[PDB]
Structure 1
Amino acid sequence: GVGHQPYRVVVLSFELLHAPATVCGPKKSTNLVKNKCVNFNFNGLKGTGV
């Protein structure tokens, strides 16, 4: 039966750490803007500041 038939199970254990990340999603890198109030996104860390 369906509950007794075998299932292939894939477990992905993600590592959410403050270390420099090696795996990332598809996203491009823009120019770095300094000394101005801008929005920023560093490796998934979003914010707004100078």
Structure 2
Amino acid sequence: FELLHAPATVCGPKKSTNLVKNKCVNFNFNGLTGTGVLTESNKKFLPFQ
């Protein structure tokens, strides 16, 4: 395997969950863990990042 190389698309069967924001919650995005508050972003990304 190789870790954190691309927009990963292959991994184990963990069911998703309803999205929540604006509250101090945990998160798990493609194996990226951590805690914090999620809010809408005014930034812009190139369509490969």
TM-score, scaled relative to structure 1 = 0.66
**Unmatched runs of 5 consecutive residues or more in structure 1:** 1-13
Give the strand-richer structure, 1 or 2. 2
State yes or no: 1:43 paired with 2:21: no
Q: What corresponds to 1:17 in structure 2?
A: 4
Q: Give, in angstroms, the shift of residue 15 of structure 1.
A: 1.8
Q: Deviations over 1:2-47 (max 9, x none)?
A: xxxxxxxxxxxx0212421010111011011010000100011110
Instruction: Compare CA radii of gyration and give the structure with the larger one.
Output: 1
Q: What corresponds to 1:5 in structure 2?
A: none
**Unmatched runs of 5 consecutive residues or more in structure 2:** 38-49
Structure scoring higher RCO (CA < 8 A, sep ≥ 6) equals: 2
Give the aligned length. Answer: 37
Taking only aligned residues, the RMSD between alpha carbons, in angstroms, comes to: 1.0
TM-score, scaled relative to structure 2 = 0.67
